[PDB]
Amino acid sequence: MATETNYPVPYRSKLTEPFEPGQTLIIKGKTAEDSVRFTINLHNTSADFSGNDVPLHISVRFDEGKIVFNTFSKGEWGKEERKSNPYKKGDDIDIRIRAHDSKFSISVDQKEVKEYEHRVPLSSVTHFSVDGDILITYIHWGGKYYPVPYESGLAGDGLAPGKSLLIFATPEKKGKRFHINLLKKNGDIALHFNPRFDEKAIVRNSLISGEWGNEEREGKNPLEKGIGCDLEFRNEEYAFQIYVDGERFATYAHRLDPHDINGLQIGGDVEVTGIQMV
Ligand SMILES: OC[C@H]1O[C@@H](O[C@H]2[C@H](O)[C@@H](O)[C@H](O)O[C@@H]2CO)[C@H](O)[C@@H](O)[C@H]1O
């Protein structure tokens, strides 16, 4: 409540379309040394009536030191389900809710902590709200089930200079390695991002005319098996700026002319939950 910026609470948003299996709602924010609690709700209602069903209610309690989940329907609350609250008053929070056909999978700090079985129709979720002692800094709802190996084209402009490709993924618990390729029309790979847990390093290289280049590694692998990560590839003037979980992990000098990077491939031991061009 010190600064504004955006996402002022009480925050409310009407979904373009009902929440569907494979989609994720991401909520990030800051709390104060005096914060007591805040809530995240997936609710029904018409358009602004407010008071209908609440398929999923999440209460983050600093007083009780617990994260509590419940559902409200037909004018009554069900039995609450609890998990420990890993957060201390102050410091940032990162809560993500992914819908599936039988439950919601909730992660805290990119670690899965709760599987909440649906008690009422997921399709009943038409809005979501966030309120309480929290300063919201980021909110996003989208994604789908991305099959892996994955391959797709990038818009018309592609990963052009000044743009960034954002990928939300989770390295498999017992996976060994995975990769992300940013390609050009002819198949050359401008940037090959290859985390190798068996080698404790992320390999970066380019594939030009069927041949692999030098290879840039080292920098201590910031990823961890089973934990979600936010990968951002920023196309800048002289090089790609690779961010991992909000921190610049490395830079990669362009070996191929930037511009026209209109292809994407993802493979290996990884689960993809979101891809956006920002
Ligand atoms: O260095 C990136 C590059 O690795 C190639 O595999 C390398 C391997 O990393 C290296 O240890 C070995 O000595 O040579 C291999 C190539 O013959 C991958 O094939 C290539 O796709 C890039 O990922």
What are the structure tokens assigned to 60, written together? 């983050």
Ligand 1 binding pocket (C-beta < 6 A) is 192, 194, 203, 205, 212, 215
Q: Which atom of ligand 1 is nearest to the CA of 204?
A: 2
Query: Helix (H, G, I), strand (E, B), or coil: what is residue 144?
Result: coil
| Gap from CA of 170 to ligand 1 centroid (Å) | 23
Method used for this model? X-ray
Cα separation, 193 vs 163, in Å, equals: 17
| Gap from CA of 215 to ligand 1 centroid (Å) | 7
Identity of the residue numbered 268:
G
Which residue's CA lies nearest to atom 21 of ligand 1? 212
The DSSP code for 226 is: T
What are the structure tokens assigned to 150, written together? 């994955």
What are the structure tokens assigned to 73, written together? 């329907």
CA distance to 85, 195, 205, per residue, from 165 (Å): 32, 17, 18
| Gap from CA of 152 to ligand 1 centroid (Å) | 24
Cα separation, 56 vs 247, in Å, equals: 32
Cα separation, 87 vs 219, in Å, equals: 28
Which residue's CA lies nearest to atom 1 of ligand 1? 215
Which residue's CA lies nearest to atom 13 of ligand 1? 215
Identity of the residue numbered 216:
E
Q: If we measure between CA atoms, which residue out of 53, 71, 69 comes closest to residue 61?
A: 69
Which residue's CA lies nearest to atom 6 of ligand 1? 212
- Residue 69 CB-half CA count within 13 A: 22
Q: If we measure between CA atoms, which residue out of 150, 112, 146 comes closest to residue 226?
A: 112
Identify which of 215, 218, 255, 265 to mutate to test ligand 1's pocket (most ligand atoms within 8 A of the CB). 215
| Sequence-separated (6 or more) residues with CB below 8 Å from residue 47 | 14
Resolution (angstroms) equals: 1.7
CB atoms within 10 A of CB 208: 16
Cα separation, 202 vs 32, in Å, equals: 36
| Gap from CA of 205 to ligand 1 centroid (Å) | 9
For the chain, list the domains and their CATH numbers.
1-148 (2.60.120.200), 149-278 (2.60.120.200)
Cα separation, 243 vs 212, in Å, equals: 23
